[model samples]
Target: DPMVSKGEELFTGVVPILVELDGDVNGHKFSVSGEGEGDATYGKLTLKFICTTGKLPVPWPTLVTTFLMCFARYPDHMKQHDFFKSAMPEGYVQERTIFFKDDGNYKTRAEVKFEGDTLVNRIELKGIDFKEDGNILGHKLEYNYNSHNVYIMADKQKNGIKVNFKIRHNIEDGSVQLADHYQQNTPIGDGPVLLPDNHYLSYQSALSKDPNEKRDHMVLLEFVTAAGIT
Candidate 1:
């Protein structure tokens, strides 16, 4: 089972292959670390709950909380690989939850606190404690985004949801990874597109014309049956 699953995963490269290793060999730029762990959102719902009072219960906010809670420190060990090779214990606790007070009229809260052994290492200043890490600190960490207006569904249909994301880029299984989502538990405002994989189309480009533009980021999911079916 492990062997089959491993191969199955390797075949799913949603993102592009762009890691350049031919430089000074930097020997992975030289970074050593161990004892690492972290958290990650559970699914699209928890992600939406995180959109606002992740502290409160939006439609299915618990889903997002569960999703993100897993990979708090996964990125570091993933990128560092043998550098840290070692892994930390399982999740410790969900200490505090806060309703995010921004994002439109509704006040959405987000949970904050530390768990697992958070680690951040780079070619620049490798190795740091979990609390001191920038990625896990503050309200929002580092994120990469693009203008994804019209989203394509899993079926073959297209909706006008914004295909966007705030990439907290990290590494794992010897490769870089991104944690993101689509239309979670929240409702889409007037005129904005929203749906899930059940009734919508498949992996077609949103309306972005950047020829090289990518859907690597999260696209809007058709969570509701009606929105998805129609």
Candidate 2:
């Protein structure tokens, strides 16, 4: 219903961006954090666009292509990102992105990165713990529905692990805004984030129905991680 209005219009407009994908991720995406527990959030450049070697099932090819996309529209993309922290570290509202396909098609996804409409940051996920209301779903359902994960790609630098600006935040709830909740993109409790040793974050996507689609929903998150922010 929400996206039912214009198919041709969107398709036509996105064809260029999609066509660009064929080329690959031009460069890395970067984001600056807001404010953390200690330091007051200030505007300053933090992370750097380190190289990517690629990992997992599709390492080299994906990395090369991802790198391609990163460089192409990176600067334009990161400007949309804003740093925010949730009351509960484990809980995530949304960050910025609309991952439809992971080099393929749109499956069950969680997009917390700057995506599509530039201001829109929602993904079509399969299992949801809540029912749009504040009421929680069944325990089993909540377990599967509320499972949030983060992915950070990086490499070892002179001082510490230098991370690439590729990350994700999965929302496990279906409830709209209850006002109690806040936005995301920070390290909290068991939530996913970048650490010195753990440069990249990865989690499985058992939430989607499409078999061809890896659980990994692509979020063009435009934030960069930095030291001292923690």
Candidate 3:
């Protein structure tokens, strides 16, 4: 009943910043190691890019569009979700135009509030003499009662490309596993390739060492392998 109280008079804010799918991904492997390993903790996780064909199944534009929303309105939406992370200085965020090449310039704004079972988001792009809008269902999240996975998207546009963003996670248990192996033209023959050859850093809330004591207030990290998928 946490979200049942305010049925429709939800508060609104204009700010921001702002999924994956299919049998596109296959076999996978993963490992985790670091000195910060202990009962639990919260710190920066980094993923370095080794390569990208610029044609991977990943929804690049939409993924980044959502990230840009997070960057622009992080402080605002951060309180609404737990999957977001950042290291930018106070009041500093990237421009929304960066995600889209040189076709045109635009700015992003967002409106968010609890609706039904999830937080609904409307990201708008505005500039020059034209304007376009996008929407994302920042899925409602809770520990145990519901899953904690983030999925974002932009409605189809005149352009042929569509943007979608997603991250696999188990925050309720302290783990993040984003795996994808899709059949495509790869180093080997036409087979599935593990996506995001780039390194990634995922964060999770650390559980208390003593179950009886207060749960650790720190965001923890872990290494997870591919999980069974549909």
Candidate 4:
């Protein structure tokens, strides 16, 4: 049986710059878009992380951000890459060959609920079957299986919306492989975050390992209202 039957669509829109991470403050503009659709209880969300700008490779921080974003989706569509759109630079084959190609796009379902005044969206990645025949950056990526449980909680207040992103990725070989390169659950920032609608909340990472690292990140959530044509 379907977990979520046909019902009213609670939220639908594009959250531009939903998650962004950069190694250098002036580095490439790596970004991710969160496109959502669902009812009050459950729905589908798509996360598209821009992995490269022209020939320049995105920073490690940005790649980590993409992982966390992808982890926040149901694993039902892990084997399918039909919703992916390639934005790779010219001279590169525009096709979805691998799971985490230069343009990493993933679609997932999430359970939506309201706890008191805060809204919670939760997703779990139990496993996925991914294979790569070619290479990106000369590294052939493959994933026999992977699992990560993640969630996002948002509290809307009079001034702004407070949000928190938490993730726990199980370290597994033959997976994305980044799990061994970076630390798990790196603190993105301190609490009491305020993000105004139609605006962005950006900050430099003070908890980075490198003191000289000017790793900047940003997030935004914008809702769109459908209007009827006259």
Candidate 5:
């Protein structure tokens, strides 16, 4: 199936595309929506999430996380592509540019890229630093290309041992997964929550619903956070 040309229809234009996801986790309503735009050479996007149930479990304040990532589906050839390309004959080659962080009210731009000889063979993260307030590193990212997973770790003790803040993401066939890994194994708060579960989703060119449609569309990317939280 790798040779069938997959993922080419994702956000690939400047026209604004608005997408909403409806789901729930352990009885909690979850909602996600965002607008995106891009061109042949580059793209800009932003997305946001909310726990629509208007309620959360104990030790948890609110359920919300921003999502962002960059890259497009490609053809059979990799050598001629911009942004990113691959020579493995098949598989995905995604490159992410910049991420926005809100933890401790820190806003930073981080970039990442994923490539593979089979599937996401190599994952890498850029931009590193310790929290401006202390030795506990903040907003650090790591990827296991082999597992196609992403992680974020920071000092939970900063806000006065207050909140457990950490994230984990997994990419695989047909679906994407994200988890809230608070305090490692201490289940006071933990999750491998997911979206788009049993939901009806649609795709199209900014021009038409046809999967074969080509031509960039332009509009607004205000919802596409520069911070790649997803």
Candidate 6:
């Protein structure tokens, strides 16, 4: 029975990134994982930002509230509130998943495309499309000429966040090359930082209206192929 023998295999793995704030090490990990075919054909992509110490100045409650109301827009407000309430104690967590495809065209959610030898993928979430007032956050990944580029942009009413960085990836051997790197930001200083395990840390503060409040955001990213993981 070829049909029985050729059953669909499962694929899943986590790509964890560290977060630091103000030269202080904060226990936070942003996990990127996907589930689909064993051959890594693409399926559901999940992005989860987990906070352990909860020491950061991010307004998780406000962000989560706005996200639920504007982006999710689930009818059962009470149920959603209860769910987040339980998840809040362990530090605030924001998890979003979208069906990922390898097609060249952008879909309503997310897509990964390849142009010649270059690979491009993007995920976007807009609040206005849901009939609510909120912000827009986009994450784009590109690989070309043996280099990997990651871009993250978030925009709100009067403030926003922007981050971009480049790294090296050896496609032939599936290995990442690490080195000291520096990323410059507007209204911020520049410096070099050492990375562990081919990981690079990028930090940018989120603009705030209050002069006394400080909101620092940091995240490191790594891309892993489904077939490479055990």
- Highest lDDT model number: 5
Candidate 4 off by > 4 Å: 1-17, 23-40, 55-138, 143-145, 150-230
Per-residue accuracy of model 2 over 155-206 as CA lDDT, tens digit each: 2232112223332322245522111211123322343222233322222222
Please, what are the lDDT tens digits per residue for candidate 1 over residues 1-230? 33222312322122111110111111212211112222121111111101221121111211221222112112221222110111112111121122222221111122222222222211111112223222232223222222222222321143222222232232223332233433222211222212334322122111112235232221122111111233
Enumerate residue pairs that collide in model 6. Answer: none
lDDT of 1 at 104: 12
TM-score of each model, in listed order: 0.17, 0.18, 0.20, 0.26, 0.25, 0.17
In terms of lDDT, the poorest run of 10 residues in model 5 is: 193-202
Root-mean-square deviation of every model: 21.3, 19.6, 21.3, 18.3, 18.5, 22.4
Which residue segments of model 6 deviate by more than 4 Å?
1-8, 12-39, 56-230
RMSD (Cα, Å) of model 3: 21.3
lDDT per residue (tens digit) for residues 1-230 in model 5: 32122223322334333333343323334343334433422433322222233432211111122222223322223212212222112222222322223322212111222222111222222322323432112212221111112222222332111113333222234322233322211111122111111111011111112244232211222221111222
Off by over 4 Å in 1: 1-57, 66-78, 81-87, 102-230
What's model 5's TM-score? 0.25
lDDT of each: 0.21, 0.22, 0.22, 0.24, 0.24, 0.21
Cα lDDT over the full model 5: 0.24
For 1-230, candidate 6 gives per-residue lDDT tens digits of 22111111111122221221111112222222211111112212222223334443222221211111011111221121111112111212222321112211111122232223222222232222211111111112222223233232322221222323433322234643221122211111122111111222222112112344243322222222111111
lDDT of 3 by residue, 142-200 (tens): 22211222222211232111223233422333543231111111111122111221122
As a TM-score, model 6 comes out at 0.17
- Model 4 compared with the native: what TM-score? 0.26
At residue 180, candidate 5 shows an lDDT of 34
The list of candidate 2 runs beyond 4 A from truth reads 1-108, 111-118, 128-136, 139-151, 154-230
Model 2 RMSD to the real structure?
19.6
